[PDB]
Amino acid sequence: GPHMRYVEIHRNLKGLRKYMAEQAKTNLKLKQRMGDMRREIRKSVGQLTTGGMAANKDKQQKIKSILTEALSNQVESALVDPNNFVVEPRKPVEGATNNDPLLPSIFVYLINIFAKAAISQFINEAGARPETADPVGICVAAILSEPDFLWRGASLIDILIAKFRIVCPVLFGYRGSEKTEQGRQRLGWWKESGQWISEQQHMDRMTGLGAGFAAISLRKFALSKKQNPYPPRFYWMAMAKIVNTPPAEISNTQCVVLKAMVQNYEAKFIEFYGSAAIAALRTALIDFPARAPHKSAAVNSLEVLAQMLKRDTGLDLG
Amino acid sequence: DGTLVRIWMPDGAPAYTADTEAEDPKVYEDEGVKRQWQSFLEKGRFEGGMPEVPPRREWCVWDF
Ligand SMILES: O=P(O)(O)O[C@H]1[C@H](OP(=O)(O)O)[C@@H](OP(=O)(O)O)[C@H](OP(=O)(O)O)[C@@H](OP(=O)(O)O)[C@H]1OP(=O)(O)O
Numbered sequence: 001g002p003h004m005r006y007v008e009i010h011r012n013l014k015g016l017r018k019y020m021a022e023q024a025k026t027n028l029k030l031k032q033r034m035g036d037m038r039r040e041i042r043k044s045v046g047q048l049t050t051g052g053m054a055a056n057k058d059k060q061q062k063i064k065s066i067l068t069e070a071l072s073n074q075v076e077s078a079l080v081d082p083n084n085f086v087v088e089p090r091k092p093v094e095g096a097t098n099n100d101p102l103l104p105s106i107f108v109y110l111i112n113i114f115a116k117a118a119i120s121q122f123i124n125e126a127g128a129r130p131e132t133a134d135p136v137g138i139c140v141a142a143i144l145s146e147p148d149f150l151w152r153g154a155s156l157i158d159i160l161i162a163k164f165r166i167v168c169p170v171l172f173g174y175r176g177s178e179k180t181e182q183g184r185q186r187l188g189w190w191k192e193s194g195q196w197i198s199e200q201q202h203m204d205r206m207t208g209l210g211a212g213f214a215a216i217s218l219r220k221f222a223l224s225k226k227q228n229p230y231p232p233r234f235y236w237m238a239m240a241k242i243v244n245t246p247p248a249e250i251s252n253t254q255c256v257v258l259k260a261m262v263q264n265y266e267a268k269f270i271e272f273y274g275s276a277a278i279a280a281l282r283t284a285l286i287d288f289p290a291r292a293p294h295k296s297a298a299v300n301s302l303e304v305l306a307q308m309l310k311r312d313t314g315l316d317l318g
Numbered sequence: 319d320g321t322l323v324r325i326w327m328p329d330g331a332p333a334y335t336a337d338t339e340a341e342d343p344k345v346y347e348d349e350g351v352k353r354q355w356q357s358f359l360e361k362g363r364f365e366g367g368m369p370e371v372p373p374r375r376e377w378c379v380w381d382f
């Protein structure tokens with residue numbers, strides 16, 4: 001199902017990147033531009049976390065210019081079937097801007113670079129300062145929803161989600177023990193040079209990815225002529241999978257991701273779901289911590305968050 | 319917060335959008351989905367847990 005396909009997408013993207021390097025050995029125009037385009041996307045994404053609305057809009061325009069150049073394919077890179085990088089195969093749609101059955105590999109490649117850079121900003125910056133996820137998320141949603149970058153009526157955001165599934169599996173319903181090797185692998189516990197990262201580094205990754213997932217799944221397109229490429233139903237579904245876990249299978253990983261999905265995103269959650277969001281917050285921050293057998297600092301942080309919501313924003317989840 | 323707090327500022331609920339509803343609305347006529355949401359419509363909160371399918375917008379209110 002979706003799991004299998006996202007794994008296949010993730011490995012198709014690996015081979016695409018290898019094949020871009022192979023092309024550059026025989027394509028001089030590709031060789032002369034490909035590296036600079038990659039570096040300019042990564043640099044621009046890296047400047048979002050430390051910038052204001054106007055500066056961030058400029059970085060977004062820069063990325064859109066590079067992707068526009070890639071789509072025109074003046075470097076004459078090989079073409080590829082984009083169905084290798086979306087969950088469900090797409091057939092032509094009437095009125096769509098781009099119904100071509102093939103896209104330039106340089107274009108797909110740089111979407112992948114863009115998605116990889118966004119993921120890295122969540123991990124490296126939102127892990128310490130979760131507030132920095134929001135501008136990265138805005139940029140992701142703005143770029144992927146650009147009418148010129150839609151393929152057969154919908155965005156290519158499956159390239160980003162395929163990677164999210166790798167690095168934060170709990171957002172997609174996966175569970176495991178932090179005390180077993182198989183469990184750490186199911187939870188996305190990362191490795192650095194073959195050895196498990198520290199628990200503290202693992203929880204920082206989960207914090208940044210929790211906040212980054214919310215940043216891309218809780219965006220407002222009502223006042224925009226663009227379509228939402230990853231709408232809030234996916235936020236609702238992800239939170240539900242976490243908060244319905246049987247008590248024996250609950251891990252601090254889930255609780256850390258959950259706090260990061262929620263904190264600072266309550267107002268947006270309520271805007272989309274109103275009173276249903278209140279009931280879901282009650283489940284996430286009152287019922288879920290109460291029925292967790294191992295009362296950890298991670299479990300307790302969810303309860304403290306409920307207290308703060310009541311003391312600060314005046315929201316009564318009880 | 320000591321006194322009454324008003325959360326929703328706009329005048330009335332947001333305009334209808336399918337983006338918050340289930341990807342395929344054919345699931346709302348399933349007995350399973352109806353049962354998950356039955357408790358919410360009645361009591362206004364989740365008892366058996368959070369429904370895995372997001373609500374229809376008609377089931378939500380924004381007057382608080
Ligand atoms: O996530 P993994 O399955 O462990 O694979 C990683 C990952 O690539 P993916 O984007 O395909 O996941 C790294 O990317 P980041 O997470 O850092 O974005 C990439 O490193 P680069 O940053 O250099 O692209 C690295 O590739 P490499 O081994 O060439 O450094 C590659 O490892 P694999 O060789 O196992 O695919």
Ligand SMILES: O=P(O)(O)O[C@H]1[C@H](OP(=O)(O)O)[C@@H](OP(=O)(O)O)[C@H](OP(=O)(O)O)[C@@H](OP(=O)(O)O)[C@H]1OP(=O)(O)O
Binds near residue numbers: 120
């Ligand atoms: O050559 P790789 O094994 O693929 O490693 C690269 C390389 O890192 P190191 O040379 O320091 O090991 C990149 O550095 P540059 O050559 O671009 O300067 C670094 O990029 P940043 O230093 O800009 O972060 C990138 O990491 P990232 O995933 O952030 O792009 C990292 O890739 P991996 O360690 O993930 O393989």
Ligand SMILES: O=P(O)(O)O[C@H]1[C@H](OP(=O)(O)O)[C@@H](OP(=O)(O)O)[C@H](OP(=O)(O)O)[C@@H](OP(=O)(O)O)[C@H]1OP(=O)(O)O
Binds near residue numbers: 142223224225226
């Ligand atoms: O596509 P939208 O979601 O409606 O985004 C609009 C749109 O952006 P583009 O410049 O990319 O097209 C506006 O431009 P027009 O499409 O109407 O030409 C732009 O305003 P400008 O007219 O100044 O380009 C505005 O940006 P801003 O709110 O800063 O005026 C921006 O909104 P978002 O950046 O919030 O999506």
Ligand SMILES: [Zn+2]
């Ligand atoms: Zn890397």
